[PDB]
Amino acid sequence: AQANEDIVVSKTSLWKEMQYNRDITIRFKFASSIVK
């Protein structure tokens, strides 16, 4: 299985239950408030 798969576990006419299995690179950052 690919590292970035996308699969369908159920599908009706308009809707569909899609499975997703994916790798991510969370690059976040704090931020500080300074009140003097």
């Binding site: 299985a1 690919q2 590292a3 499975q19 299995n21 790798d23």
Partner: protein, 272 residues
């Protein structure tokens, strides 16, 4: 060929194809550096050729190919001849390595490549394995669940992976067939290939020069067989080894049989 063959039990036994298969075939020995070191002679190859000449093999039919070590030979072996003999030194610190070498050369493998980054693979049957070659192979695996996450491991934190190899030149790996594994490999230094074990290679013959029979070709623990072309010797020199091989070369090549699959100089077929 899909067609059948027919025969009979009344026909006569033909003459010996020996003394002609010799002429129209080539022989190749694989000796360790230790042999030439203990010998300290520069014409031993021509000597052994002149000896083989009595057994029938003509002058330009025998060949010798040095290999510094079992693992340096295990790194992408290339057996390109018609009758190969290998002389293998025994060491309990190298048992699995010189069993994997056996499993690789005695058998005939059909190998596809592997892209670990873009794909996650699995073994279908008890003949599919992963064989990895290079200078230092460190292989770790995380088995996966139905939703493509980890089982006793973290799909990202490579420290949580499960180590099946540590700085090994040739690794033959079998994992639980039916689940998807995420791999981590030293791809810079090692290539890994998904290989299926076909019928055996009857062109080569391993000769364990020292200790008792330990080679377990079959990765399953139940069989532990001993094929006909897996021989053993007890040794204290190397000239006696080579004289014994030359004296009993007919039995060896009667235990061996030319190939049927194809013409190929590597130790494994490639089918992408």
């Amino acid at each position: 060929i899909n067609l059948p063959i027919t025969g009979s039990m009344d026909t006569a036994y033909a003459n010996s194809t020996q003394e002609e298969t010799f002429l129209t075939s080539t022989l190749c020995l694989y000796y360790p550096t230790e042999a030439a070191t203990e010998i300290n002679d520069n014409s031993w190859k021509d000597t052994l050729s002149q000896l083989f000449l009595t057994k029938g093999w003509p002058t330009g039919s025998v060949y010798f190919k040095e290999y510094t070590d079992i693992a340096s030979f295990s790194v992408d072996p290339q057996l390109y001849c018609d009758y190969n003999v290998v002389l293998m030194k025994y060491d309990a610190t190298l048992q699995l390595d010189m069993s994997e070498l056996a499993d690789l050369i005695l058998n005939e493998w059909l190998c596809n490549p592997m892209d670990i980054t873009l794909y996650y693979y699995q073994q279908t049957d008890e003949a599919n394995k992963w064989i990895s070659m290079g200078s230092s192979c460190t292989i770790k695996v995380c088995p996966l669940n139905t939703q493509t996450l980890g089982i006793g491991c973290l799909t990202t934190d490579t420290a949580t992976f499960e180590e099946v190899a540590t700085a090994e030149k040739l690794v033959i790996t079998d994992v639980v067939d039916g689940v998807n594994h995420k791999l981590d490999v030293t791809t810079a230094t090692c290539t890994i290939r998904n290989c299926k074990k076909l019928g055996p290679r009857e062109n080569v013959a391993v000769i364990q020069v020292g200790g008792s029979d330990v080679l377990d070709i079959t990765a399953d623990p139940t069989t532990a067989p001993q094929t006909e072309r897996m021989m053993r010797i007890n040794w204290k020199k190397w000239w006696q080894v080579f004289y014994t091989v030359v004296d009993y070369v007919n039995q060896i090549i009667q235990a061996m049989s030319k190939r049927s699959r194809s013409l190929n100089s590597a130790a494994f077929y490639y089918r992408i």
